[PDB]
Design an enzyme around this catalytic site. Structure first.
Site, PDB file in Angstrom:
ATOM      1  CB  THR A 150      -0.924   0.041   1.220  1.00 32.25           C
ATOM      2  OG1 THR A 150      -0.128   0.055   2.418  1.00 32.25           O
ATOM      3  CG2 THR A 150      -1.832  -1.179   1.227  1.00 32.25           C
ATOM      4  CB  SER A 151       0.385   4.534  -1.711  1.00 33.62           C
ATOM      5  OG  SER A 151       0.846   5.858  -1.531  1.00 33.62           O
ATOM      6  CG  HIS A 167       4.659  -1.001   3.816  1.00 42.08           C
ATOM      7  ND1 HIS A 167       3.513  -0.878   4.576  1.00 42.08           N
ATOM      8  CD2 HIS A 167       4.369  -0.455   2.611  1.00 42.08           C
ATOM      9  CE1 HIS A 167       2.574  -0.278   3.861  1.00 42.08           C
ATOM     10  NE2 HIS A 167       3.070  -0.012   2.665  1.00 42.08           N
ATOM     11  N   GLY A 168       7.316  -2.698   6.868  1.00 38.86           N
ATOM     12  CA  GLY A 168       8.304  -3.587   7.436  1.00 38.86           C
ATOM     13  C   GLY A 168       7.690  -4.857   7.996  1.00 38.86           C
ATOM     14  CB  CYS A 170       4.384  -3.364  10.154  1.00 36.37           C
ATOM     15  SG  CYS A 170       2.912  -2.350   9.981  1.00 36.37           S
TER      16      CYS A 170
END
Lengths: 5, 232, 4, 234, 4, 5
Positions: free
Chosen positions: B29-30, B88-89, B130
């Site tokens: 996701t953006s 993100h992660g 994340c």
């Protein structure tokens, strides 16, 4: 060196 | 000494990696709101007298290359090093625009034996990402080569981290706010403790999806620092 | 609110 | 301010799990020096006015039963909770005498929603144990709270790394932790005490071994704080 | 010195 | 050392 914003 | 020497000519670099859009090949996701975070951090660390470098939308290859080159600079006149990762992660992992990279691979460049002009100096990694997919429902002679690192994680290991599309991420919002209010008063751990409280107490998710609604977040300070850190 |  | 309320009638429990001797079938070596750790910790936390309970040589089943029972106690009159784990380990794992237990299983008993008389109170987990097999070569010179809030993990070593224990003096970390608490518990916030412990282990200790692979090695402890307030023992 |  | 229960 260097900067986008 | 009880506190890091912070009166070198320069406070240090503040590298901000801001990944908002990811290749279609990834699906991810953006990350709406992350530009608010990146601008908030730029201003906050500017006021702390860091040399801020903003970088947007870097592939995992460019992230590794950027970190390598920065670790090869001469930091002799700098008190510290700050790196902020916005993306993100997953546990142990940050995403470049085109895939995951190991945090350990990024931080290894700055080991006491691999970056000698940062040896003995505080190396701060601030991570909005994340660390898994759990949700919190809430209730009510020589030094070690790994010494002098601090990782300020937005969330507990295993958990999602929350980001608001208009206001920015809960963690960075709170981090900038507490630094603006307390950087001239409190040692950094005590600042990050107030960040923990602010995120833990003042934020709760609102979602039309019952599964993601009314959830909570607690950030996680991972400190391998050997001294107290003051920004004044 | 969205997750990272 | 921003400080935990520490003037409940009692400071709280300090549970010390001291695993020295392991079942032969596990192949795990005996942890000489750990009794020194356990006694040092008992005296240190006694002076901080904790109710200390020492447990020795517990099976993985007994560790889980102990933690479960203690989390079911009424902590309403206690300010905090401390658990010290002394054993073999790996990342995410501490060993009972007969096999591993997940650290996440242990701490989950004390979640804000599962142990209500400790909700909003500091839960400290102090862990002397390996987190892997890496060696550090060193370098010269409604209002709700999250259920994972108010935990602190003071690990002896960084993720992925061995932790060191001296058979005569006890572990580097526990040695240093007890000394720093004795010296500073009446004047410094806990995170600042643990930072001094970081400093002490990092600078004052270095391995000596006839085995080149294990000789001249270093250690940095790791603080993991999910605390929401400052913690003072006075 | 021994490891844990 | 000891043992308390």
């Amino acid at each position: 060196v260097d900067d986008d914003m | 000494d009880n506190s890091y020497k912070m009166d070198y000519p320069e406070m240090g670099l503040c590298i901000i990696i801001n990944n908002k859009n990811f290749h279609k090949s990834t699906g991810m996701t953006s990350r709406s709101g992350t530009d608010v975070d990146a601008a908030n951090l730029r201003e906050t660390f500017r006021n702390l007298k860091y040399e801020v470098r903003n970088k947007n939308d870097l592939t995992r290859e460019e992230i590794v290359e950027l970190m390598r080159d920065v670790s090869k600079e001469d930091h002799s006149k700098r008190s510290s090093f700050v790196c902020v990762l916005l993306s993100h992660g997953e546990e142990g992992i940050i995403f470049g625009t085109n895939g995951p990279v190991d945090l350990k691979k990024i931080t290894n460049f700055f080991r006491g034996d691999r970056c000698r002009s940062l040896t003995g100096k505080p190396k701060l990694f601030i991570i909005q990402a994340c660390r898994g997919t759990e949700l919190d429902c809430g209730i009510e002679h020589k030094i070690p080569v790994e010494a002098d690192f601090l990782f300020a994680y937005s969330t507990a290991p295993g958990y999602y981290s929350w980001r608001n599309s208009k206001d920015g991420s809960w963690f960075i919002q709170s981090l900038c706010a507490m630094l603006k209010q307390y950087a001239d008063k409190l040692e950094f751990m005590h600042i990050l403790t107030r960040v923990n409280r602010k995120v833990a107490t003042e934020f709760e998710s609102f979602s039309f999806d019952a599964t993601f609604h009314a959830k909570k977040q607690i950030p996680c300070i991972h400190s391998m620092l050997t001294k107290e850190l003051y920004f004044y | 609110d969205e997750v990272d």
